[PDB]
Amino acid sequence: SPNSQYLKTRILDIYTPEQRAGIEKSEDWRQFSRRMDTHFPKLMNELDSVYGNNEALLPMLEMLLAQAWQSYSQRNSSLKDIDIARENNPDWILSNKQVGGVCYVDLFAGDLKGLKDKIPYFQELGLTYLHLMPLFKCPEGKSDGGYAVSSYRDVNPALGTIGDLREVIAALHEAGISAVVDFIFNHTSNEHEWAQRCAAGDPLFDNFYYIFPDRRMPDQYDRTLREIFPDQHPGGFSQLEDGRWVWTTFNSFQWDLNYSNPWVFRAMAGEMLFLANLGVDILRMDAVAFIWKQMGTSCENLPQAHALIRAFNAVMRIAAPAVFFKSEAIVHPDQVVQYIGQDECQIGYNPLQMALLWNTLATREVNLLHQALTYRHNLPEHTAWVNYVRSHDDIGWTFADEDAAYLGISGYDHRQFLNRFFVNRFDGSFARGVPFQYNPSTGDCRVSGTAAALVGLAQDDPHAVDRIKLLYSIALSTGGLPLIYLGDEVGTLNDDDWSQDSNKSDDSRWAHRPRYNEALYAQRNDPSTAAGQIYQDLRHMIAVRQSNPRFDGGRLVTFNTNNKHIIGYIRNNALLAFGNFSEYPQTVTAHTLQAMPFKAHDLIGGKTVSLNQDLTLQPYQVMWLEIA
Ligand SMILES: OC[C@H]1O[C@H](O[C@H]2[C@H](O)[C@@H](O)[C@@H](O[C@H]3[C@H](O)[C@@H](O)[C@@H](O[C@H]4[C@H](O)[C@@H](O)[C@@H](O)O[C@@H]4CO)O[C@@H]3CO)O[C@@H]2CO)[C@H](O)[C@@H](O)[C@@H]1O
Ligand SMILES: OC[C@H]1O[C@@](CO)(O[C@H]2O[C@H](CO)[C@@H](O)[C@H](O)[C@H]2O)[C@@H](O)[C@@H]1O
């Protein structure tokens, strides 16, 4: 394979003799050259592992690297400073100081300019990380909430212009907040120019997607394909006007990109560089599990999918060091963690913890949660979990059947219980969620609904507020970067019109995608309201997390509480956390605490607690005891 020095010389051949001389002496080239030598080996290796001796590999690479240089040269000086800072501080993502939030620009603040006006509030809340949902042009009507991209560069006019976005990013950086956007690279909308030209037979866009003449291949593939939206279509394919079939893992209007074609990688790498130069700090790698297909397999988590992502990682290491990745892999735990690594995705959603928080609220038993915190929490160096309570999506019960089997729990039977409980089809359930994608052929089902809707706030369950606080307390202190679903900090309930909207009625996820609730936000300072109680609660926990070094890092050690309703863990051997998932008082005996100091200050309630005697926690109470 060619080497870094070889490719760099060729990159400089576009400059006349006089220019070439100057370029080689410039700071930009110096840094670019150094990073090329350091990271090119990985890029080449990962790409080769996927394409092999593909004739297009070499040509695609030189073209991509030429862009990488141009992209780095044009990169703004301020961004280059962030590039240097993060190069030498790979663990910035692990700082206890980081706290993120996520919202739809349109639902939360109208448009881009409006979002800019909400920045003061984000600072007031303590955010240092902000994820904005899909901002670029997409089909009018149904676009899977913007996840069906028709243009990676043209901002949805309803939100503003590319200029407004560029402005928002700079304002976020000014307020000490990182910009986080989606990198929907597994597929585009069926209205995207690429799709159009590919299907129309433009030789330039040949093999940019997976299109079949009939059901021969589709049927073979469907034998092992999981259905994500069985409500929309069976298997993973959709039929075109002309009768052909296109691979559509998600909605029919979302066509999977064909990474078996190296020119497809180059295309998306180009888009990443575009997003990088806008000043994006973290790219949410959407559906990383499906970017590689292979007949007979599930076409999820394949080796080449990981390799491609590590290739993308390399491009950023060379042309935009500040850009980190956030893996969205809502799959089996064993698979989830494989996307997380310094050379792949530095951080990734922690669906296991999230799903188990809700599970524990239902069963009142921390068994599965404790198991996960004990065996699946700690990660490799320079990587972190993104811990969350809810997201724009439904809740999938992605705990491991094998893990559950160890505890004498039948995964299938357990999920059936969980699903019933959270959609209020179980006696006594406090949850008011809505079903999502009930698959009659598999028994699988997911749950939609806001955090407040699932804890019982819609009916004013007296335990609703403390439940919210408890869940967020755990995502905030286990170790990793905590993500707040904006709207949750004031107990925002479900949207009560989505079912009436013909563009949303067939997607219950819109039930937990409500608009900014002016009334609730106007009560965040009133301790007598649910909004105020939830707000000050979370704000206080955020404040503590960010100021107390004992929460730093992502490592944790579980503590056996000897009480099936109480979870316990220790951060940095100095912070002991207890969490009662019972609606009744529960005790951690003096005998269980013998190894703990006689007294410890609780950062949650502010009181001094004695650990030389039984410790009784009130319903849903959380304690952050300083033991060192
Ligand atoms: O305080 C609330 C209620 O708490 C108590 O009930 C709890 C149980 O203690 C929990 O263990 C849990 O029970 C679930 C169970 O987790 C779930 O797997 C399912 O059990 C199935 C099982 O999967 C299947 O293999 C087969 O064995 O049938 C089982 C049927 O139970 O469903 C259980 C619930 O039925 O959650 C409940 C409810 O929170 C306490 O007993 C209640 O009195 C109390 O109200
Ligand atoms: O349940 C309300 C509403 O949700 C939708 C949209 O997602 O469908 C969900 O609920 C159905 C019944 O529980 C499930 O069969 C389906 O799989 C699930 O997505 C609407 O169709 C329904 O009216």
Angle subtended by helix axes 27-51 and 4-12, to nearest 10: 120
Q: Check if the beta carbon of residue 596 is closer than 8 Å to that of residue 627.
A: yes
- For a pocket test of ligand 1, which of 412, 413, 421 has the largest count of ligand atoms closer than 8 A to its C-beta? 413
List, in order, residues 6 or more apart from 239 with CB less than 8 Å away: 245, 246
- How far apart CA 325 and CA 347 sit, in angstroms, is 6
Q: Is 539 exposed, middle or buried (0-12, 13-18, 19+ CB in 10 A)?
A: middle
List the helix and strand counts (H, then E) for the chain.
Answer: 22, 23
Catalytic residue (one of 328, 466, 488, 537): 328
Query: Which H/E stretch holds residue 372?
Result: helix 367-375
- How far apart CA 69 and CA 46 sit, in angstroms, is 20
Classify domain 187-258 by CATH number: 3.90.400.10
Residues with CB under 6 A from ligand 2: 231, 434-438, 499, 506-508
Q: Check if the beta carbon of residue 340 is closer than 8 Å to that of residue 379.
A: yes
Q: Check if the beta carbon of residue 131 is closer than 8 Å to that of residue 101.
A: yes
Q: How far is CA 608 from the centre of its chain?
A: 37
User: Quick one: which ligand is closest to 447's CA?
Assistant: 2
Does any ligand 1 atom lie closer than 6 A to the CB of residue 626? no
Q: For residue 342, how far is its CA from the centre of ligand 2 (angstroms)?
A: 39
Does any ligand 1 atom lie closer than 6 A to the CB of residue 364? yes
Å resolution of this model? Answer: 2.1
Establish whether domains 1-97 and 187-258 are of one fold: no
With tokens 């300072």, the residue in question is 525
Domain 98-186+259-554 has CATH 3.20.20.80: yes
Given phi > 0 = left and psi -120 to 50 = alpha, else beta, which region is 351? alpha
- How far apart CA 366 and CA 352 sit, in angstroms, is 13
Active site residue 466: no
> Quick one: which of 537, 390, 543 has its CA closest to 465?
537
SS3 254: strand
Active site residue 583: no
- Give how far Cα 78 sits from Cα of 10, 85, 179, 385, Å: 28, 11, 14, 27
List, in order, residues 6 or more apart from 198 with CB less than 8 Å away: 205, 206, 207, 208, 209, 211
- The residue type found at 202 is D
Does any ligand 1 atom lie closer than 6 A to the CB of residue 606? no
Q: For 555-628, give the CATH class.
A: mainly beta
Catalytic residue (one of 182, 191, 256, 286): 286
With tokens 């915190």, the residue in question is 373
Does any ligand 1 atom lie closer than 6 A to the CB of residue 401? no
SS3 455: helix
Q: Check if the beta carbon of residue 577 is closer than 8 Å to that of residue 570.
A: yes
Query: Which H/E stretch holds residue 363?
Result: helix 351-363
Burial 402-427 (b: 16+ CB within 10 A, else e): ebbeeeebeeeebbeebbbbbbbeee
Q: Check if the beta carbon of residue 490 is closer than 8 Å to that of residue 523.
A: yes
SS3 566: strand
Length of the chain in terms of residues written: 628
- How far apart CA 332 and CA 399 sit, in angstroms, is 7
- Tell me the pairing of strands 615-617 and 566-571: unpaired
Q: Spell out the domain ranges in the chain.
A: 1-97, 98-186+259-554, 187-258, 555-628
Write out the two tokens for 438. Answer: 């009930």
Q: For residue 292, how far is its CA from the centre of ligand 1 (angstroms)?
A: 40
Largest CA distance in the chain: 81
Domain 1-97 has CATH 1.10.1740.10: yes
